Amino acid sequence: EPHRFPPDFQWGVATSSYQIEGAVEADGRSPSIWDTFCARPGAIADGSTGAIANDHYHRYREDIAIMKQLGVNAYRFSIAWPRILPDGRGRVNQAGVDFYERLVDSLLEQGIEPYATLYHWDMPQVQHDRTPWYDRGVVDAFVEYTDVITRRLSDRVKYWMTLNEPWVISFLGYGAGEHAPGLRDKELYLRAAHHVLLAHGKAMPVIRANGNAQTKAGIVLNLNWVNAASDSPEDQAAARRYDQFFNRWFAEPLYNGRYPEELLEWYGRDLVPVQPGDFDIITTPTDFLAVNYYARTTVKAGSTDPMLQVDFVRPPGEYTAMDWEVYPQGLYNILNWLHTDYAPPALYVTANGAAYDDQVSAAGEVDDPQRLAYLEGHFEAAYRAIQAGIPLKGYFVWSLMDNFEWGRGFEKRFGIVFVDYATQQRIIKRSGKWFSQVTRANGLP
Numbered sequence: 001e002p003h004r005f006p007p008d009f010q011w012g013v014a015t016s017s018y019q020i021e022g023a024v025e026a027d028g029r030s031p032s033i034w035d036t037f038c039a040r041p042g043a044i045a046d047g048s049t050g051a052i053a054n055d056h057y058h059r060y061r062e063d064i065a066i067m068k069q070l071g072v073n074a075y076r077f078s079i080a081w082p083r084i085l086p087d088g089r090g091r092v093n094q095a096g097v098d099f100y101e102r103l104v105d106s107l108l109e110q111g112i113e114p115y116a117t118l119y120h121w122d123m124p125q126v127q128h129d130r131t132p133w134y135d136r137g138v139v140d141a142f143v144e145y146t147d148v149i150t151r152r153l154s155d156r157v158k159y160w161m162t163l164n165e166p167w168v169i170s171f172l173g174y175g176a177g178e179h180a181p182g183l184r185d186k187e188l189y190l191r192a193a194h195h196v197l198l199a200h201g202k203a204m205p206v207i208r209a210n211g212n213a214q215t216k217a218g219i220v221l222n223l224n225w226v227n228a229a230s231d232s233p234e235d236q237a238a239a240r241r242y243d244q245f246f247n248r249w250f251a252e253p254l255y256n257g258r259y260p261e262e263l264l265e266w267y268g269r270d271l272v273p274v275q276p277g278d279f280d281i282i283t284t285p286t287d288f289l290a291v292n293y294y295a296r297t298t299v300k301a302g303s304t305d306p307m308l309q310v311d312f313v314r315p316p317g318e319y320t321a322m323d324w325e326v327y328p329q330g331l332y333n334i335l336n337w338l339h340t341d342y343a344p345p346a347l348y349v350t351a352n353g354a355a356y357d358d359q360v361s362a363a364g365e366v367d368d369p370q371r372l373a374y375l376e377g378h379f380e381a382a383y384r385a386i387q388a389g390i391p392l393k394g395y396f397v398w399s400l401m402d403n404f405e406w407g408r409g410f411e412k413r414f415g416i417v418f419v420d421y422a423t424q425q426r427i428i429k430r431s432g433k434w435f436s437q438v439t440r441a442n443g444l445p
């Protein structure tokens with residue numbers, strides 16, 4: 001009774017432009033908000049930057065050959081706005097566009113389907129200098145970028161994601177000051193959450209317009225399974241407030257043309273710069289919803305978080321090196337909520353994986369039994385999802401290989417493939433050799 005997935009199921013791995021590329025000055029690429037952010041003392045746990053990362057710019061062919069070994073039929077990557085429009089708007093940089101053409105051409109000729117994320121956090125600094133995410137002019141700036149690169153590649157690229165993890169882009173970048181540009185203000189975060197949604201909305205008909213009937217496009221939300229520490233009244237209020245903050249702040253606008261009522265009031269409705277016609281734009285029909293899932297979050301009333309007044313409770317169980325609770329059930333539940341609340345015609349897991357302190361054995365091998373366990377569990381939760389009649393068409397592991405993990409630097413390795421930063425050597429981990437059996441059996445033995 002082998003648990004096998006639908007025939008045309010998309011098995012993938014996922015990267016982002018700044019996390020893998022390096023060659024940060026190469027071929028007229030301009031500094032991104034992250035290139036400048038990495039300079040800030042205490043911003044990156046290990047004091048590193050994305051200047052070299054995985055050197056995937058000069059080494060993409062090797063990586064595609066490793067992907068062919070992994071046996072995937074799809075690859076999720078982000079395009080770097082800094083390479084395509086270095087000045088933010090205006091002159092297209094052909095050298096920049098040249099790279100993504102060589103990358104997509106290399107992918108298609110190995111029969112790997114490209115999934116192009118338009119924006120994975122790496123705005124050109126010169127552009128941010130004019131239109132931060134909290135300034136409404138960003139919407140036009142993003143759409144122009146989208147138009148350029150979707151004109152160049154939509155012949156060869158059918159699947160487009162608009163923006164990766166609005167909640168991250170807005171709260172981590174402007175809310176908690178933990179990501180580029182690293183500002184920390186309730187209003188700034190909300191304006192940014194709203195202009196990200198608006199930007200996703202206006203970019204949709206520009207993607208379809210540059211494509212054909214075969215063109216498919218959607219947003220990427222990160223969603224956590226939220227849980228109340230107790231069935232008490234003001235704890236269920238903390239969980240509900242935190243669920244609305246993370247999950248429902250982006251979902252509700254996208255499908256029901258509205259922010260959650262309780263949290264919108266809690267904040268002050270005036271802080272959110274909603275102009276007339278915005279909800280028409282944000283609700284623009286999409287082909288799929290893409291989902292990043294990592295962990296469960298159990299919540300009580302408290303003051304750890306000044307803004308939401310919540311504390312986090314850690315239930316007894318399995319934790320990754322990231323201090324993220326391992327809870328595959330969470331993935332089945334998130335998919336099922338989305339299925340029943342919003343009825344998206346397709347779902348994708350565009351990112352799921354786990355960081356563990358890897359070690360190269362004397363044999364030059366990487367034995368990561370804990371990552372292997374993590375992925376099996378979530379693959380299982382994804383299989384149980386399909387058997388309930390949830391239209392999950394694909395699954396991309398985060399990540400193909402160890403990379404720049406943002407504020408945690410190179411210390412947190414997510415790859416099913418090890419990278420020795422000393423030599424740039426790729427070693428397929430045990431979890432990778434196993435993933436190679438899964439993709440080719442199109443299921444779990």
Ligand SMILES: O=[N+]([O-])c1ccc(O[C@@H]2O[C@H](CO)[C@@H](O)[C@H](O)[C@H]2O)cc1
Pocket residue numbers: 222223224292293294295296297298312313314323324325
């Ligand atoms: O899917 N996402 O975007 C996501 C990923 C990892 C997350 O991390 C969780 O967050 C909580 C608050 O920090 C922790 O208390 C909890 O133990 C951890 O599992 C939470 C959410």
Ligand SMILES: O=[N+]([O-])c1ccc(O[C@@H]2O[C@H](CO)[C@@H](O)[C@H](O)[C@H]2O)cc1
Pocket residue numbers: 016019164165168222292351398405
């Ligand atoms: O605050 N959180 O819960 C959170 C933070 C960053 C997140 O990041 C996601 O997952 C990976 C790291 O977790 C990234 O490497 C990747 O760029 C992104 O899609 C996802 C969630």
